Amino acid sequence: LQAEKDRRVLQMLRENLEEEATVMKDXXXXXXXXXXXXXXXXXXXXXXXXXXXXXXXXXXXXXXXXXXX
Amino acid sequence: MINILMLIIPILLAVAFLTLVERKVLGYMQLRKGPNVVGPYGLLQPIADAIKLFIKEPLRPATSSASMFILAPIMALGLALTMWIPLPMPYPLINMNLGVLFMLAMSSLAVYSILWSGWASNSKYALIGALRAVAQTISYEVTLAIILLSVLLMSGSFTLSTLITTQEQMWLILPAWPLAMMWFISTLAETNRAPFDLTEGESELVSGFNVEYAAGPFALFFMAEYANIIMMNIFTAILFLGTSHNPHMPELYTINFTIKSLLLTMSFLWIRASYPRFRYDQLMHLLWKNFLPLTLALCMWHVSLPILTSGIP
Amino acid sequence: ELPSLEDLKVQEVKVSSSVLKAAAHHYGAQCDKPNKEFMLCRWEEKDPRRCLEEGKLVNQCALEFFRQIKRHCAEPFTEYWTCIDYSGLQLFRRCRKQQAQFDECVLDKXXXXXXXXXXXXXXXXXXXXXXXXXXXXXXXXXXXXXXXXXXXXXXXXXXXXXXX
Amino acid sequence: MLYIVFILSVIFVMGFVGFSSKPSPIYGGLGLIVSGGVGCGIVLNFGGSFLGLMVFLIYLGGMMVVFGYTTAMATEQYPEIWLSNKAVLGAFVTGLLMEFFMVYYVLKDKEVEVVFEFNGLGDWVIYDTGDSGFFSEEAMGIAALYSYGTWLVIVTGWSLLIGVVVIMEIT
Amino acid sequence: XXXXXXXXXXXXXXXXXXXXXXXXXXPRLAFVGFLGYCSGLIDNAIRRRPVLLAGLHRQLLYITSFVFVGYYLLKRQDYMYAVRDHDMFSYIKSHXXXXXXXXXXXXXXXXXXX
Amino acid sequence: QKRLGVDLDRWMTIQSAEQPHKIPSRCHAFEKEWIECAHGIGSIRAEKECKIEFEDFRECLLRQKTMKRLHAIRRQREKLIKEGKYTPP
Amino acid sequence: NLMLALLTNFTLATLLVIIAFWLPQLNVYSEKTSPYECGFDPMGSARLPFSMKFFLVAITFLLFDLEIALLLPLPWASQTANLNTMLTMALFLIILLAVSLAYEWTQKGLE
Amino acid sequence: AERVAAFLKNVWAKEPVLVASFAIAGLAVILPTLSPYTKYSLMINXXXXXXXXXXXXXXXXXXXXXXXXXXXXXXXXXXX
Amino acid sequence: NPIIFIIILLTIMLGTIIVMISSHWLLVWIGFEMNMLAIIPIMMKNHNPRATEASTKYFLTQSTASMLLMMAVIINLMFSGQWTVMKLFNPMASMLMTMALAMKLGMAPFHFWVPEVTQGIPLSSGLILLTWQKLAPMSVLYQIFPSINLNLILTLSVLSILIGGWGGLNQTQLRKIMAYSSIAHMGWMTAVLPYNPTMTLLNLIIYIIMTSTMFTMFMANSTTTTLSLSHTWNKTPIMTVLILATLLSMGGLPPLSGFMPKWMIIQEMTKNNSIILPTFMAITALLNLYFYMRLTYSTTLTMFPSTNNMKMKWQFPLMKKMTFLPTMVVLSTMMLPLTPMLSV
Amino acid sequence: SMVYMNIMMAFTVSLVGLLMYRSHLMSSLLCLEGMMLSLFVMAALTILNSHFTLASMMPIILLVFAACEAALGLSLLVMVSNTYGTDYVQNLNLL
């Protein structure tokens, strides 16, 4: 169960570096406080947010019922 | 993927080599010599029919229909040969999340082959063989699911992989004594070469899904209809037979599994020769009126048994 | 949102291969005190950011568990590991004959215990860490409660309707 | 290639046009097999093999009863193809413009919609579910239950008793 | 009030607030008793029977049933009007700022001619 | 309900209840807040005090607040072609 | 893959039709007929209702098939929930189905 | 006998399958209530854990120990 | 017919209980479908060419309506999540919700099935079912009175009395007159739902009692105005006085119980400050009075309907509540002003 | 969100299908099972994404009632042909 949270933290730090690189000049994106207005529980929900790029890795992680190897 | 291609081409040959057994065993049952002239024991005749019926035979129906009709032999093979995929075997091709659900759903979808052949000819002569094929299948789909449920509650879940492991000491024929006798009758729900059977053979009425079809579509129907007979024979050898598992040696399982199925493969052709047709009305009275209260009483019995004595996967 | 540090917790984390972990259920008996305290932290406080410090001790003890087996009685451990991967996912079936060679070598050392039946969920607390019981996610009570008064009505003189 | 469910949802609506644009209960009957069977794949890809294959068990079996009244009762006069009639084909050609023209806006940026919600892309967001549960996994993994909803068992048992008695009075 | 807040949902009688005292031989009860007697007059018109008033003595069932149901109906009436007044008076005291008093004033008003 | 049930109960209707076995809901963290906010009568009838917690609940099931955010990231990556590209994975 | 397994069987099946479609060709005369099987000109042209006979027994299947689908929890649900509470409810659906078939005995129909 | 033995043999003579439909289904209701073995099956059903164990904070508690093999709570020992 | 007819009638009673005692949105959907399976067998009974037309018309113009209700139930999963019968939350959900209920209660654009269905029933006892079925979806609307857009419920109140007040004028069939009298009274029902939910339940109590009496007065066979005309001059003379009393109450008149709806509906509407809407409600209510006025001329006038056949034998009907209910339908004005509180 | 918009668009076509009548009455009973099919897919996706487990029983109940109306309407279709000849929306007597 720790291995799940170890991967989810590493995926979050990769997303933080990508957001700072893409948005610099004209667009307004703070990334702080996040989408949720509660900011006390902070759900992971790493399925829609997890892996922004690379199609080969994303397709294998999303599908479990499909193919099923 | 190589496994799927190694499960169609040798399987179509098994439906081809069935034609030997369909008149060799059936022949000796009627005291007559079957295949003899063509090959050493007529072994070259089953492969000769593939050269006979496809390359030279040309028919397309007269008044016909549009896209449908020729859609039906595609529906015949493309739904009955797919049934080989969820089979547990020694090792299954893509082991299903729930096994027997895919086996029961695609079998009912395979009935459509004889259904769309009713609208193959717009003329009313062909659809009488189709309307008869409705009732000879529609009623027997009730018990086919119920008798499954009594066996499935006795052993494991819907997954076909667990059904091999559950039979380690004794077969499932002995606990399910009246239910095993039901699966010699309920297996013949689909239009199969049998005495119970459906509207497919000649005898009294015109041949269903054959009078409208050619040779080429009609030849493709037999490669699907006789394929279902092997399919039910294997499926009975999983649910009721087992003997041994052995995950280390697949060789010991593959020989032992085939002998159990082949004894059942002869048994349906044994049924076919022996007994006359049950009639359209009276087949609806064998089940529903007489057998459905019996199966539900055993279904009631098989609900109590895991509660009476511990039997939960 | 405030994410965790880029350095991350636990240096050289996790075992190299799976099924190896599933083959040994002795990890439940030995080294349970760091495992259960992380478990107690995570259910009380749902945030992974708060109880990552206790999770560092879990991975550190995990490396200490496997190194003990690799030093003493390694050959029966490897033969049991090759047996479980040869089959599908039987876990304990068919490999019970090779399981006789295992455990018996481990019994020579004091670092051996059988599961027997079940864990039955054990409760123990010996760390606490700032107690931590009331946190949740709630911020507002929303006007506490609606105003309610009980005094019992007498009769009320005359009905409110037009005809009384 | 990334999309799995989205391509199947196109085939789902494709069969549904042959209902508003009436093609007779044989060509319109095909819709419950073609779009119905692909419609199971929409359920299957999200999860739960039970409820996904439950659509196959009834909507093919119950369609055979419908087929028992396609060659019966009323419709046996002319086949009536959806490619022949001018009143029928006109509804199909406008029916495809309700589906195929919508997919044209999906490619590049968010798609324009009649509803207030924007569609966007959503390839990895199509699943929108974490692993979480492992042993006895999925909400659909233990879906059907007699416990908790004990009142629901009685009324379902009642409704399947009423019909058998009622249809006998009608016929 | 339409929705219950103090009282528990689904109840035939009040029970929680029983202290109110029901009416004894009320003028309203006599009219419901007259309606019970009126039903015992018109039933002999539908089923053709001699005399409306001096007919069958099954009329006593019609008088009793209207009084019995009516007594519980009148009990619900006096209860619900009391709760309505109880909630209204409690609302003014809890807020205080919502209500304002103004008394004793001399102000000019336009008078009509002819 | 116009008439409510007494003694015997046939509930298991609302979200975040006693689970089927033990498996919890995906939106259980936001489900707990909505029950805690609207347990009093003067909250949903007012529909102003629980406005903050309802908007957070809308984010859970629909994911519309996260959908428009992730749409902007994927568009900018597609717009920047052959000028400023990064690929750590 | 389930998709790659199902399509490869389906594409091989439809390809065999094409082999039997294009290879045999020489002449197509006004020779093919509507009814066939027995011969002669069709007295019943196109389509006519026929119907009836099995109208009640077919309808009951559509009603019964839903109940068997509701019986499918039995081997898969009875794992976590209490058995004593389930026993009264699990049998209950099977008992009432026998009651409906008992009402089916008093005049079954024309079939 | 008027209907116990006199009417029972009439069901055997005409439509004999009706006897089995009442007898086997009838025993399926009577047996799970009277037999002293049905309570054991529910015990193992509750004992088998589907979800992971939960740790509770200990502050003056009886029948609660560590995860190691010790007498705590109850722990199933019903038949091996 | 002998035993199972009582069971079929009981399942409508039990079906409404599922709707009445509910917390889940799929549970009421079951309750609506419990009615579908149980009314249609009593719709047929004798099996007529007229009954076959009406039964299929009642099925198709109600089962498809409930299917629109299930969409609104599914939007309650799409938006707001929770399966609770309290609020719809979404304005998009409420639009498909209200129009589904309008097929049973609103009537203003969905009245079309009613006159054909009511005439299609062969039995006088079967006529009670349609007036009693309307109790079920009213209990749903009593629960979800907030969130719903008042602009498209009050149109189902104003327009319904217009078509109800016009649709009965050109009809001689006695069942058809009562079919549009239903639409006329259902127009008032949809008007109280935005303006104070109490008294709306009492509106039904006044309506159901008044209509259940009406059809039980037609236990002596009558299907047309001219057939009900021969009632005092050939059959029982004192029976027509009670028919006169019920018809004079069906239209809003003060010395009868049928003014108690008109009492509180306008009273509660004016408290919310609305003048132009309840004025139009009163003028259109006169159009409702005209049907009963022409039908009181079958009890007051001579009209010459004597005929050759004359009845001498005493009539023995069922008459379930033909004695207790008309007394509450005639002289409930003095024991009435305090009754709004007693209902809810 | 994205997948929901396609199956909602399939619902609207089947909505028109129940309101459109041409010659035969058989089209309505296909669309009755058609509209229930579209509602079933909508229910399956909503419950599974934001997991319920308890409320995943509800569409199974819905699927039972999906054909409860459909079986009764199809049996009513039988008796119309017995009174007339062929079931027609074009052929009706009542006003």
Side-chain angles (χ1 to χ4, degrees), chain H:
Chain H
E2 54 177 298
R3 60 184 76 178
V4 186
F7 268 89
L8 204 141
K9 282 188 177 181
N10 290 303
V11 200
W12 279 96
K14 283 188 176 182
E15 295 171 299
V17 196
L18 283 164
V19 189
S21 64
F22 277 94
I24 306 159
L27 285 157
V29 191
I30 308 157
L31 284 160
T33 51
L34 287 160
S35 62
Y37 212 86
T38 51
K39 288 282 275 179
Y40 277 90
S41 61
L42 206 142
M43 284 285 283
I44 323 150
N45 197 282

Side-chain angles (χ1 to χ4, degrees), chain I residues 32 36 62 65-66 100-107 113 134 137:
Chain I
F32 279 113
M36 303 293 174
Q62 219 182 54
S66 60
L101 293 148
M103 276 267 203
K104 294 160 192 171
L105 302 169
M107 303 277 93
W113 61 271
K134 286 177 276 280

Side-chain angles (χ1 to χ4, degrees), chain J residues 20-93:
Chain J
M20 282 274 280
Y21 286 92
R22 285 177 195 272
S23 66
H24 315 283
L25 200 76
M26 272 282 277
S27 61
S28 61
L29 280 150
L30 296 152
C31 288
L32 277 155
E33 281 173 296
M35 282 266 278
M36 284 311 297
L37 194 93
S38 60
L39 291 163
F40 189 78
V41 179
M42 279 208 75
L45 265 71
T46 44
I47 293 157
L48 189 60
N49 282 319
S50 298
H51 300 268
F52 267 99
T53 326
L54 294 149
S56 54
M57 173 66 176
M58 308 301 106
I60 304 152
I61 306 152
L62 182 75
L63 147 141
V64 169
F65 281 92
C68 276
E69 289 178 322
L72 198 135
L74 207 72
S75 65
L76 281 161
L77 196 99
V78 182
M79 298 311 283
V80 176
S81 64
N82 284 115
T83 52
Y84 295 97
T86 49
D87 274 52
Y88 265 85
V89 200
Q90 206 180 110
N91 193 38
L92 276 141
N93 197 282

Side-chain angles (χ1 to χ4, degrees), chain E residues 30-50 54-55 57-82:
Chain E
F31 193 82
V32 188
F34 190 82
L35 281 156
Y37 192 81
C38 194
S39 60
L41 292 155
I42 54 100
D43 75 316
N44 295 296
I46 301 146
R47 290 174 183 89
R48 208 195 278 264
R49 292 284 283 266
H57 275 276
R58 58 185 175 183
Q59 288 184 58
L60 280 88
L61 188 136
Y62 281 94
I63 304 151
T64 45
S65 59
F66 267 89
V67 167
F68 193 81
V69 174
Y71 185 79
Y72 281 90
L73 208 141
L74 276 146
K75 199 181 273 180
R76 285 188 182 98
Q77 282 179 4
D78 288 295
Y79 169 73
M80 205 76 188
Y81 271 99

Side-chain angles (χ1 to χ4, degrees), chain D residues 11-107 120 122 130 133:
Chain D
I11 322 154
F12 188 81
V13 192
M14 192 75 179
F16 263 87
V17 193
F19 284 97
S20 176
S21 181
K22 184 186 177 148
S24 297
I26 285 297
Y27 293 91
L30 271 173
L32 291 161
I33 296 102
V34 177
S35 74
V38 169
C40 304
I42 298 158
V43 193
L44 279 152
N45 275 296
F46 272 83
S49 60
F50 185 83
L51 196 136
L53 291 157
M54 275 279 272
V55 207
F56 269 128
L57 295 155
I58 302 155
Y59 285 92
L60 298 175
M63 179 55 216
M64 292 184 199
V65 190
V66 179
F67 184 80
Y69 301 116
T70 56
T71 43
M73 304 297 154
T75 50
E76 284 278 80
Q77 279 169 301
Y78 267 94
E80 284 180 51
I81 323 150
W82 48 291
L83 291 153
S84 62
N85 287 59
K86 285 182 180 180
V88 175
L89 199 142
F92 181 79
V93 76
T94 51
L96 57 90
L97 285 162
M98 285 283 278
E99 202 274 302
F100 286 92
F101 206 83
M102 199 179 77
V103 189
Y104 192 81
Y105 286 91
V106 178
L107 299 157

Side-chain angles (χ1 to χ4, degrees), chain A residues 5-68:
Chain A
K5 279 171 177 68
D6 282 317
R7 198 176 284 180
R8 281 167 186 175
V9 166
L10 285 161
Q11 283 285 110
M12 279 289 283
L13 277 151
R14 200 178 285 180
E15 283 175 63
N16 290 311
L17 292 155
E18 283 181 303
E19 280 190 61
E20 287 181 300
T22 49
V23 182
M24 274 287 283
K25 288 178 181 180
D26 292 294

